[PDB]
Amino acid sequence: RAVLIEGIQQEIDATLDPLLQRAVKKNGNQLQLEIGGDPIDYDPNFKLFLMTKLINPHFRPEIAAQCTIINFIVTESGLEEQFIAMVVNIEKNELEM
Amino acid sequence: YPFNMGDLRDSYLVMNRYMEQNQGGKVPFNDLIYIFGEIMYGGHIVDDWDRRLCNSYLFNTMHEQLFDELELFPYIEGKGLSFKVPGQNPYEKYIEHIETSLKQETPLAYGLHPNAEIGFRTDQCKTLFNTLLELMPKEQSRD
Amino acid sequence: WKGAAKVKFPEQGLCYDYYYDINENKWNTWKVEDYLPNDQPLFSKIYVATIHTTRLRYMIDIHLQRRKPILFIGSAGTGKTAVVRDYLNSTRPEQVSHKTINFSSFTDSLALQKNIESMVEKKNGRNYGSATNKVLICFIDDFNMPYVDKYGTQSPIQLLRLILDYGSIFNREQLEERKFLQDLLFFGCLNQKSGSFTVDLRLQRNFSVFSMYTPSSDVIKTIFGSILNAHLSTIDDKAQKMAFKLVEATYFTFDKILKNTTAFAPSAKRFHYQFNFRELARVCEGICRTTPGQYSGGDQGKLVRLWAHEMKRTFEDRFIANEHVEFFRRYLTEAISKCIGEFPETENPIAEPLIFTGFVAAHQGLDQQYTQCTIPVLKRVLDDKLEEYNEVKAQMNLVLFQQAMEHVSRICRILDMPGNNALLVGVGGSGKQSLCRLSTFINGFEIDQLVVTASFTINDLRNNLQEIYKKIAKPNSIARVFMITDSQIKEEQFLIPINDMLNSGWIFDLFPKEDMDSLVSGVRNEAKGEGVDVNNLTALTSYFLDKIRKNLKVVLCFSPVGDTMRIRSRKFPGIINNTSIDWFHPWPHEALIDVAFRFLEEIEFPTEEIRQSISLNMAKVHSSIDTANEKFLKLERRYNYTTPKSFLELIDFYKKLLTEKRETIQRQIQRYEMGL
Amino acid sequence: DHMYQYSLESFITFFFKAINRTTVRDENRIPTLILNIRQTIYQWISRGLFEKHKLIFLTLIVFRLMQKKIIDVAYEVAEMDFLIKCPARPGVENTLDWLPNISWDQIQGLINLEEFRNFAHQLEKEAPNRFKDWYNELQPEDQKLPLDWKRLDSMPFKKLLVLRCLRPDRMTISLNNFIRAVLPQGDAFVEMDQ
Amino acid sequence: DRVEDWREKLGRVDVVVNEWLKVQKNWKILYNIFLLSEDIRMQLPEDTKVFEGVDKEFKDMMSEVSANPSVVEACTIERRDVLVGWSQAIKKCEKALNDYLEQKKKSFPRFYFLSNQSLLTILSNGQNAPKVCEYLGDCFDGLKTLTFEPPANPAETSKVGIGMISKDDEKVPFSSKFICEGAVEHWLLNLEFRMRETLQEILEGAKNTADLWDSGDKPREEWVEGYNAQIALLTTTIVWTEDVGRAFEDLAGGSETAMKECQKLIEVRLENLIKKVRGDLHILERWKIINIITIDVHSRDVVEKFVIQKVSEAESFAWLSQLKFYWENKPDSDMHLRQTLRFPWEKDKNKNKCIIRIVDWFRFYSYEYIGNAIRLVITPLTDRCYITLTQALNLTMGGAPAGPAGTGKTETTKDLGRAIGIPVMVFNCSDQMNKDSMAQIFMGLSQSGAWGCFDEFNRISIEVLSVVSTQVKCVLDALKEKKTKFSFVEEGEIQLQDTVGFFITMNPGYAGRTELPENLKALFRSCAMVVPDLALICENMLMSEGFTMARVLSRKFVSLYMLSRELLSKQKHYDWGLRAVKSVLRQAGKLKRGDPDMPEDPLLMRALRDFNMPKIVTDDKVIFRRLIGDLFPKLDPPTKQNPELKKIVQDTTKKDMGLVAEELFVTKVVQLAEILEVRHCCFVIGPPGSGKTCVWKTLIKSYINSGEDAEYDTLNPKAVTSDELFGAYTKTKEWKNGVIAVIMKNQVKNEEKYKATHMHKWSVLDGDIDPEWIESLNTVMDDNKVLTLVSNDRIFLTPQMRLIFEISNLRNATPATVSRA
């Protein structure tokens, strides 16, 4: 179905670089991408989430283009905007249902 | 220096063992200050200026006049705190006598000057604004 | 030293420029043999004698007559290697036997011993010298480079201090055998400001040290003056007087770069900004390409452009910051107002669309020109040649916008210059790899890229390299290019072979000495045809190395990110100095609108006015991120980065999302129209 | 300090607890909801805090309310920065007999704040008559500077600024007095669990 | 369903495969314990016959599976349940041994300090006595082995013991023949007692002849020769406590001189004993006499301190504090209450017993042989560290000496115990200590009245450390109640000998520290350990090397080296630490033994100046020469110049080298020759371009032109890799002879550097010294002339072979590496 890769702070391993390339090689009917030493078959509807527990990360520009960066950081007005929806659900529970 | 109730208990067990052997004979304060000061508060102290201090306290309190009422507070000549060692009374009286010593905390109790407290309050204020500085968030968030 | 007791100097000269003649007893001044023009195609073989180069040639003969090892110490591009590489070439082959050891940082005490053991024969007993008492020169170049361990002691250097003093290298197999070495000299070529700035004073003692000074206003005028005056005596009788005028300028500009250190100085970020002889050589090489027919006549304007361009594309290329590109063009239009002094019109010979290319003449059917095309002539030829590369090789679709047009132009130029290896620095996704493959196909050359698996070894690289060196060494050979990238170099060891290929000829010990006695033999039937001396076996080996150097181009393709290039440049001297750098900037606004519009073709749009208009907003968005990305680095510490590949993957996604969205409606609307 | 680490998940329960303990039904709720949440979160943290950090944490709150301007207090950005770290500029040897050199060195820092630019020349106008008399007195935070620097007493944060510079001993009591005045139900925050 | 059947088959294979590896490994151990041990076989006849029935099966079942090799064919649920059948029965015949070993540890409680492997070996060779004795070196402080009477039948090993041998080969004869009876743990407990009996028996003979060397013809120095090191020290300290006791009794009479005469007599015996260590003696009878010096120098320092403070009363604290050793038959013996009586002389109350008093802690001397181990110098700090620990043992809690590493916390606890007589065990706690491993230590400590010092106890896992408390508490809680038999946490009913003590030597600022739970700290009376005063250690080292006025000189000495650090130009090649002191004192000692009549001041002056000059640079020569001229004010130093070697060096340098023989050059060649004559390992350091090679090369070409062919194998150490230099195993396990190491073997014999007539061979190592490279050679750099390799092949460096290191800068060098050479 999917794979979440934890840690992965910065400098993505060389074995992922072929996978990180969105390119998949079409060997007739069955699709097969070359990851690691030996190429393995690749089925559709595969997801690969990478997550980085790191305040202010630094990526090589080459990697930032190859993988889309998405910053989930609760900071300043962030929480404020969560706590409103939180409070308005508890306080005025009428006209939220 | 880590001082613990075990260190006081230890120095009681040795004091007990030394007052069971003398009995009617005069007490050996000079023997008993070394074992108190140099041995039980040797373990902790290496500085050799703190060691001179640690003994001076002990030399002051522990002598023949201790059994008569004696100002435990060092060199209170004409200050007026005068916290004494209680005379012969029931045990219960000793705990009441410690509640009778003035609630007001003075550095003058330890032999330091009043103006030693004034320095501690300044050091207290200094340690607030060094911890506030460390935790002061976002640096005002610009303007 | 003009406090010199009884024997006073003549005035009007330094103490250096005077040797004491016994027969006159005067202090005559060093006499310099005026350059005679040879037909060396490699510019590295050309050697113009100066005052400094003769008074060193003497000092090398004075340290070879004795067994006193010499060390030359001077800035990265001062021409130390050339001074020694001339002397060793001019030695007698029965007196002296010369072999260079180019240190790589990774040249350990084992690797030096293998090089020295290969050089030296076996005398009687445990002794090892040359039989017939020859002098075995082991010329170290880049003496400083060897890897400085944590403590501060370079293993190969400490070995030499065991060879000079006691003369006894412990045999690394059988570590009991003393193995005494005899009749060796060592000729160092340390540059200050690279690797271990200085080597252990415990060696520099054993050596005689000889400064090689940064390029003087006279030394430049006596070298490059002598090369052009010689090479314009050819082209035309007029347009000589332009030689000294252009060489005056190429200095004037070169000086106003070195004197403004706050703009252009070698730094941690500006590690490749090293401006020394190397550049003036491949400016004076690019003017030496003028063929008599297509230049002869009034050269007041045509030359000075060819200059402006050749200058421009060995300095602009180098530069990172656009402030530095502006500073340069001010100097370059001061130089032309003083030295060339014409300021021909209101229109400067220097301009934006100044492009000179030798393949545009070829393609049409004109013979070995290096004349300027205009952009619209370059647009027809390149577009026609991309059609010709898609049709024969594996298909590569690129746009060819003016800035990518220029890039092929100034890579086809660096491949055409024989010996000169290209170095295309740019953020991964720039299409440096794709543009090189084009540039290579434009010229009659055949690109050889190694194919790295996940499990790759130094020995398998050394069979891929050895496969290429079987194709070059046959005589009627189409000069093979060698493509390397940042990803291809998995570990830092693989570079060691590559740095020895691009430094000079071919990587020492990639064959047995039985295979190389057959490769030499295949090029004996070519040498007779050239008219070069045969059965000399010194000039034939030398002539082959010149053919291998000429028929091998080494294009490496790095990115300037996280100082991975800087640490490579530090470790291997070859990479930066020996190759003609060309930097890949992010795509201009004018380019992006074109690139977007080519991909938006084969998508429907109501009034086609939209399709242009979208492609404006597709550029603006990608230009409007780069102005926010800069705002984001200044305001907070958070680093973001965009590449031209990032943009190319937007245009794809929009095209894909627009079809999906429109196909969902075109289905939905069909149901309603069918039903109505 | 280690083991003052609080989860978002744990905080959220105390934030909602505070909303569900409000007895006020929409009259002045939004005002009385804020107040209840501050006290609730404050006590929750303090119970965990050691003796020495309890005062530090309470000042952070009232300075972060000040910083975000939830409560109206006469403060300048530069003035709060100066209070949290006093730069001591040497150069002016001219002193008074009663003033320490350190106190004076801080005043030459204080004069860089546009409000207290003339505060030096003022201190050498009626020096022993007013300021010695002030500086000497026990509890000077409730006393007034009789060279018409009265106005500073009427703005509790600017006066708190002066006290650090001249007489730092009293700061820890002056701040405690200031908390109580400026913060809503401050008297209840400072007392807490006595 | 094909896959899940295959998964169940692999699932079955994984159980039976692990069951052989569980059995085979556990069988292999229990098999080896029974194999070749007819001793252990006859002891447990029930669990050995059962085991022989499980081995004979296992060999047959293994040869019946050899037909079906593959796991798929071999694996059956029948095979699995049979192997679970053995795991259960081999668990019983390992619990049988473990329960048996515990019986023999409980019978003779020093075994608890042997590794269980060594205990199994001794029990296996119960008949072969001389193999048992070998491992008593691990158990005991001294008594390495026993001597023996060569027996009747040469096939039999000798039972009859005629003497005991120390770890330095000092012999203490037994009064009669000590036979080795049937059981091992029985004749060892019989031996453990006999040790103390002989020691005790000899002390009666010592203290009778000790009162006689006051008046009688036999002096003090000639008397010490007769007896052991332990007994000749004890008897010296017993007659000191007597002397000072007779000096207080006289000073009660009013004789002011009594304490000054006491001081005079102590200081003459000390002087007369220093004149004995100067004259050529046997190395065993050096320490027997120098251990007496370090106690006598302290004896003096106490009676000085009594005369200065004017203490004219015994039972003042000053005298109670000092560690006293009495020799009385107290007719009112309080000793039966203070501790428990163990030994027969202790209970007799007719014969005189040696008793040890200090600040209301009086405990008999527990005569455990020590065998001339070196006693530490007694400092004003160590005097207090005795009060602390003694007070702790009287207050029935442990003692925790604490301070920076290098102070010797572990060594001062050991020395107190050694003085008292008691056996002191040391444990190197490595954070691998389990509950069980520690529980066994304490049980054996508790049973055999011994003292557990724990070197780096600070690195014990806070988990197991919280148990240590529960175990220590249980023992101490028993000692307060004074129970002879006490319940431990597990294996309850155990004997407690009263004299047990615990000492945790904690490095307070060491990294990876587990802070003791407050619970545990409240059982351990801490002590404050400071780096011992440099003055006191030098004052010993001076008296070791025949200096009578050592006290005064040693104050001059500490002053020089201390000021030198502060006011000279700090160099890496300077050593002003105690290590460099010892060397300069050794070379001053050889110059005292040469000319004893000369005053001590001009001789030390000369030695200090002579050896610190060649270390010292030009800038510092002019300030250092002045600094000596401050401490030694009016002493005019004459430069001691080798008159013969200086001439032959001048001749060689000119004739057969060619170099000019400058006065300052030959002075450096003479200065190298003098360094090489005493120090095997030399550093001819200097600036890059100077005469470093030429100086050692001219020395060689004098040793050739004076003595015999001095060969030299010049390797550049940094040039070759550290692996290739010493040599290491290839991919194939075959050890290659490396450069330095094959030179070190080739030089011992058979090469060009061989020993036929070569009076001085040496390998010159002319690279920069770095810590990684030199680390492998650190063994030879030290006092030991022993080189260790990766293959564990030893190369014993000859005394006529040197290591000359030619180095520009000691920038990467460790401060120790400089001191060593």
Ligand SMILES: Nc1ncnc2c1ncn2[C@@H]1O[C@H](COP(=O)(O)OP(=O)(O)OP(=O)(O)O)[C@@H](O)[C@H]1O
């Ligand atoms: N007393 C002397 N008389 C004549 N020549 C000398 C004398 N001492 C040194 N030299 C010469 O000066 C040089 C001294 O250098 P040397 O051979 O001692 O090496 P080094 O400097 O010790 O080595 P390193 O540079 O590795 O530390 C040699 O050339 C030697 O011949």
Ligand SMILES: Nc1ncnc2c1ncn2[C@@H]1O[C@H](COP(=O)(O)OP(=O)(O)O)[C@@H](O)[C@H]1O
């Ligand atoms: N006299 C000369 N004639 C021709 N080319 C020269 C001369 N002096 C220097 N060069 C050129 O300068 C460049 C850089 O100098 P090089 O000899 O490689 O050594 P270095 O790395 O020490 O500068 C080379 O391409 C060399 O051919």
Ligand SMILES: Nc1ncnc2c1ncn2[C@@H]1O[C@H](COP(=O)(O)OP(=O)(O)O)[C@@H](O)[C@H]1O
């Ligand atoms: N001018 C261009 N127009 C369209 N696509 C381009 C252009 N330049 C580069 N590209 C695309 O960008 C890709 C960059 O990848 P690659 O060729 O490996 O170069 P790089 O060396 O930058 O990694 C090219 O393969 C090509 O598909």
Ligand SMILES: [Mg+2]
């Ligand atoms: Mg070069």
Ligand SMILES: [Mg+2]
């Ligand atoms: Mg690339």
Ligand SMILES: [Mg+2]
């Ligand atoms: Mg040398």
